[PDB]
Structure formats: C-alpha cells, structure tokens
Amino acid sequence: TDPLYIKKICLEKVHDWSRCNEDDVCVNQILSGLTNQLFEVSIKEDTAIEYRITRRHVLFRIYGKDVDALYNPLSEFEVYKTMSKYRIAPLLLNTFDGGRIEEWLYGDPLSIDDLKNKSILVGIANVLGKFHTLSRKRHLPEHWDKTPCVFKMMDRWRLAVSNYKNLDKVTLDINKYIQESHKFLKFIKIYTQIENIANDIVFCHNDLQENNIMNTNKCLRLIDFEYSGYNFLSADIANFFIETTIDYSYNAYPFFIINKKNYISYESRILFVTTYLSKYLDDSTAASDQDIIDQFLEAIEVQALGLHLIWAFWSIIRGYQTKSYNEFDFFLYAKERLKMYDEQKQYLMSKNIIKDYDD
Ligand SMILES: Nc1ncnc2c1ncn2[C@@H]1O[C@H](COP(=O)(O)OP(=O)(O)O)[C@@H](O)[C@H]1O
Ligand SMILES: [Mg+2]
Ligand SMILES: [Mg+2]
Numbered sequence: 156t157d158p159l160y161i162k163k164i165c166l167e168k169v170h171d172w173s174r175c176n177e178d179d180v181c182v183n184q185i186l187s188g189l190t191n192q193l194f195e196v197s198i199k200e201d202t203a204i205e206y207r208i209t210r211r212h213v214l215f216r217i218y219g220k221d222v223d224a225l226y227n228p229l230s231e232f233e234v235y236k237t238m239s240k241y242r243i244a245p246l247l248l249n250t251f252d253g254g255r256i257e258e259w260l261y262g263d264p265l266s267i268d269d270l271k272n273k274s275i276l277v278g279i280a281n282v283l284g285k286f287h288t289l290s291r292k293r294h295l296p297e298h299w300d301k302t303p304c305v306f307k308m309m310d311r312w313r314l315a316v317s318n319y320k321n322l323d324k325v326t327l328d329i330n331k332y333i334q335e336s337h338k339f340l341k342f343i344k345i346y347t348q349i350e351n352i353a354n355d356i357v358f359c360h361n362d363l364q365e366n367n368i369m370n371t372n373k374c375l376r377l378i379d380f381e382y383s384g385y386n387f388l389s390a391d392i393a394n395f396f397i398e399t400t401i402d403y404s405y406n407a408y409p410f411f412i413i414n415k416k417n418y419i420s421y422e423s424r425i426l427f428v429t430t431y432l433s434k435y436l437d438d439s440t441a442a443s444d445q446d447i448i449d450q451f452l453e454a455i456e457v458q459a460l461g462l463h464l465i466w467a468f469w470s471i472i473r474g475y476q477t478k479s480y481n482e483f484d485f486f487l488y489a490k491e492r493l494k495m496y497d498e499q500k501q502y503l504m505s506k507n508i509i510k511d512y513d514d
Contacts, residue, residue, distance in 0.1 A: 156192070159177060161196060162177045164251050164256075165196045165213060165256065166180065168248075168250075168256060169213055169256065172198065179202040180196060181195075181199060183195040183197075188473075189219060189477065190218075190224040190226065191217070192254070193214065194214075196213050198211055211259075212259035215256055216254045216256070217253055217254040218253055223476060226381065232255075234380060234383055243289065244377065245258045245378060260369045260371055262369055262370045262373075263369070263370055264367065264369055264370065264378075265365040265369075270419070273423065273426065276419070276426065278375050279375060280427045280434070281430060281431075281433075281434050282376075283363075283395075284434030284435035285435075288435060289357070290358045290385075295358060299384075301385045303356055303385055304361050304390075305343065305387060305461055307384070308361070309336055309461060310340075313464075313468055316468045316472065319471070324486075324489075324490065332496070335464065339464060340461070342511070343458075343461060346454075347387055352432070352447065353387065353389035353451045354387055354454060355388050357385070358385055359387075359388060360380065361383050361386055362382045362394070363395040364394070364398040366403060367379045387454075387458060390462065392428075392431065393456070393459040393462055400414055409487045411483070411488060425448055453508065456499070456502075456508070457503065460499050463492045463495045464492075470492065471489045473485045474486045474489065
C-alpha cells in the first residue's frame with residue numbers, strides 16, 4: 156500500500172535501476188482482483204533516456220492473503236516459475252517478502268469487441284494450440300498433480316460454498332446446484348473416456364478470458380496463470396467460448412454485461428477449432444475431418460456445462476470475501492452463471508448428449 160516502499164524495493168531489485176532514486180520512479184496501481192495488488196512501476200521517461208534505462212516498466216505483484224486467497228495455494232508460484240522459464244508467462248524478474256516483480260508487457264489486453272475480429276480469433280487459436288502442446292513437447296515437473304482441474308476447482312470451491320450460512324440466493328436453492336455439481340463430475344468421468352481429441356489432458360490456462368490475453372502487437376501473450384494446471388483441453392476452449400458473451404469493462408453497476416446473442420458464431424467456432432488443431436496436432440493436421448470438428452464442438456459444450464457451476468461457486472466465495480466492501484456484484488454474476496448452467500443443461504438434454512445425467 157505504501158508507494159515509497161514499492162519504489163525502494165524496485166530500485167533495489169530491478170537491475171541498473173540503482174542509478175535512479177525514489178523521485179525518478181512512478182507507481183501506478185492497476186485494476187485487478189483483490190488477491191492481487193498489482194502496480195505499474197516505471198522510471199520517468201526523461202530520466203530513463205539520459206540514464207539510458209532500457210527496462211522502463213515492471214509488473215509489481217503483491218501477494219494477497221494466504222487463505223483469504225482461498226483459490227490456489229503456494230503451488231501458484233511453482234507453476235508460474237515453470238511457465239516463466241519456458242517463455243510462456245511474463246518473465247519473472249525478482250522476488251521480495253510478500254510478492255514478486257514480473258516483466259512488463261507493453262500493449263493492452265483484448266477487448267470484448269476484439270473477440271468479434273476473425274483474425275484475432277485465429278490468432279488466439281494459434282497461440283492456444285501451440286500452448287497446449289507443452290505437456291508433450293517439454294518436460295513438466297513430475298510431482299505435479301495430473302488430476303484434471305475441472306475436478307479440483309469444482310471440488311475445492313463446492314466445499315467452500317457448502318459451509319455458508321443461509322445463502323438466500325435468488326431462486327433459493329444453492330444446494331440444488333451443489334447436487335448438480337456432483338452429477339456433472341460423475342457424468343464427466345464417464346464422458347471424457349470416449350476417444351476424443353478434446354478429451355486430451357494437457358496443461359491448461361483454466362482462466363481464458365479477454366482480459367488475460369495481452370495484445371502486444373508483437374504477438375498475443377497469456378497472463379494470470381494462478382489457476383493453470385492439468386485439464387481437458389476442451390475446458391480451456393469452452394471457457395474462451397463462454398467469455399465471448401461476458402463484458403467486464405462496463406463501469407456502472409453491476410460492472411458486467413451478459414449478451415448471450417454475442418456467443419461465438421458456429422462458423423467462427425469451426426474456424427477456431429480448425430485453426431487450433433492446425434497447431435495442436437502440429438504434424439498431420441489433416442484431422443480437420445468435419446466429423447472430428449462436430450465432435451470437438453460437442454465436448455466443448457459439455458465442459459461449458461460444468462464451467463458455469465465452477466465459476467458460480469468461485470463468485471459466491473468472492474462475494475463473501477468482499478462481503479461489505481463491494482463494487483462488482485459477485486452474487487448477481489453467480490446467478491447469471493447458474494442461469495447459464497440451467498440453459499446449457501436444457502440445451503444439452505434437448506440434443507440427448509448428457510445421457511444418464513439423472514437430470
Ligand atoms: N506483465 C504484465 N504487463 C502488463 N500488464 C499486466 C501484466 N500482468 C498483469 N497486467 C495487467 O493487470 C491486469 C490483471 O492482472 P491479472 O494477472 O490478470 O490479475 P487478476 O486477473 O488475478 O486480477 C490485466 O488486465 C493486465 O492489463
Ligand atoms: Mg486476469
Ligand atoms: Mg487472476
């Protein structure tokens with residue numbers, strides 16, 4: 156929170172910033188969540204060229220809490236260090252007591268409007284396909300839990316919502332969707348055993364939204380790996396497909412807009428899956444069979460069903476963590492995700508896809 160202390164740390168822990176002093180450093184907090192105290196720390200451009208500083212900016216990350224950030228543990232840093240070493244995440248620069256300093260990526264995150272740009276969608280599928288090949292093209296730490304994160308996130312966040320006194324939701328029954336959570340996990344265990352490319356277990360980002368894809372214009376880069384891990388690759392794409400209908404940049408209550416009509420078109424979904432497999436299969440990309448594509452798209456819609464329950468639980472816990480100092484309406488967002496679960500589940504049953512789901 157102290158700005159002068161941030162300057163004193165960066166002057167000490169960023170190389171050749173020792174030439175500068177506190178009155179050459181600018182500290183600017185950037186919007187994020189509350190598990191983050193992210194700052195844009197820079198050296199004033201006038202001083203930066205006469206001293207000839209080449210690294211003008213850095214990302215200053217202050218770890219928030221430890222069990223009030225009840226989402227990841229300390230495994231976040233070990234995963235981030237791996238992603239940093241393989242030049243996938245922003246380069247780790249240094250660490251300090253309470254947080255770390257990361258390479259500053261110039262540019263802006265993608266907007267909700269950029270997701271309508273077909274060349275942007277193709278560029279995202281290219282990056283995602285190349286990214287999902289990491290587990291098989293390089294050596295990941297052998298002790299990592301290979302349990303798909305769709306199970307871990309569903310379990311560890313459904314248990315947190317379980318212990319909450321009288322939710323008094325809109326349409327009351329939070330335990331209805333707690334029971335629905337068990338039905339999805341029991342179903343998805345059987346479903347993902349069908350030999351489908353979309354059921355491949357790879358290292359996934361697990362939070363693919365537009366505000367986590369940087370448009371450096373040099374390329375498209377991923378950030379915010381706090382939830383990344385092993386998962387069905389179709390869960391990463393389903394998250395991105397869902398996020399084309401959610402606009403977080405609205406600046407009045409409830410600070411987001413759901414436009415379900417803006418869902419990525421069927422043609423764009425085919426183009427995305429076509430471009431994705433062109434880089435994920437890498438070699439014999441000829442598996443752009445239409446039967447294979449209609450199948451990728453099906454498993455994507457199945458994973459989307461559980462994602463709504465996963466992120467509704469996440470929002471409920473985020474609502475109680477923010478309990479009485481609020482702006483974003485996490486509880487309304489949780490309802491919108493639960494409503495998306497009812498609509499997606501009814502759409503899946505209308506096509507007879509989630510058989511033996513027990514409703
Ligand atoms: N290395 C970086 N360089 C530039 N901007 C960053 C960097 N890391 C994060 N940001 C900015 O911070 C915002 C949120 O950070 P993020 O890591 O996504 O935290 P969270 O999503 O948990 O709040 C992003 O919208 C992005 O603009
Ligand atoms: Mg983010
Ligand atoms: Mg995050």
